[PDB]
Amino acid sequence: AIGKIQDSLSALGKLQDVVNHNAQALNTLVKQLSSKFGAISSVLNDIFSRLDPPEAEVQIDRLITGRLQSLQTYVTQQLIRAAEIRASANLAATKMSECVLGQSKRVDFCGKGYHLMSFPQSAPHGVVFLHVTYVPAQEKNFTTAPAICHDGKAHFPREGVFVSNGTHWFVTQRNFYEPQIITTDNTFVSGNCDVVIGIVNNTVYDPLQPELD
């Protein structure tokens, strides 16, 4: 199952998007220098070469305002985008603690299925989590009952569910089919068989008497 992971790789679009977004802001920031913003030219030396100071101060001030606005746009977006990568780094740090340094009961926080363990891998500007999960398979249907009556008393399972294979009843654990005989060491007693809806008759075996013959 771990071997199949390489086949699925040989995905990381979330990591390429971070690179793309910054490359696009740097390519745009440079391109915005070739704009006249309504001035006679876009080059602060050419203005002087063909114009007197009284009027050149106005033309250069227009270009300065335009390019200063470019920097304000750039920095504002970097702050808004840095908050998003920071929120992602907080999620990755939280999973590093809760998925890798321990076992989590949080649903879907550490993969799909029942969390067993996770292994980290380093990626460029990111982290990859290999989530190992427990998935049940191949179910069968059974008849069940909440309790069993014996000697006029209600017996409830300590852990597990009562199942019937068609002719006999057993106790099983809830996550894997593994039947055992219903005994007095497997169950506990509480109340009488007059309050439980759906209680059924069966035999609960006491180990004491067949030891005493």
Binding site: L91, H125, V135
Partner: protein, 115 residues
């Protein structure tokens, strides 16, 4: 106002095909200037509308996708998923008798370039 709206081009990628269809958003197909289909979302040109429903391939919008399956390009209503009834009763249970171990990936960004 004299009807206006954006124009978008739907393309499978030049490494798949060079065919394209165009949706004129909330534009009637009589006021735009083969396969012409009028939908409540605008005028769809270049795809045929079918009554079947498939898994989404090329997403157009408002529940409609296109695919290259049955080749030109088609417009169809997306399927939502498989259907399944649980065999519920008042005294029946289902318990697994076997299991598998699965491995899945999750990817998270942690940093940008410092400029």
């Amino acid at each position: 106002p004299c009807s206006f709206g954006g124009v978008s081009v739907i393309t499978p990628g030049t490494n798949t095909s060079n065919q394209v269809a165009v949706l004129y958003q909330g534009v009637n197909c009589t006021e735009v200037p083969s396969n012409v289909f009028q939908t409540r979302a605008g005028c769809l040109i270049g795809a045929e509308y079918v009554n079947n429903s498939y898994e989404c391939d090329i997403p157009i919008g408002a529940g409609i996708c296109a695919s290259y399956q049955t080749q030109s390009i088609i417009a169809y209503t997306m399927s939502l998923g498989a259907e399944n009834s649980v065999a519920y009763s008042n005294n029946s249970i289902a318990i697994p008798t076997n299991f598998t171990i699965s491995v899945t990936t999750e990817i998270l960004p942690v940093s940008m370039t410092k400029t």
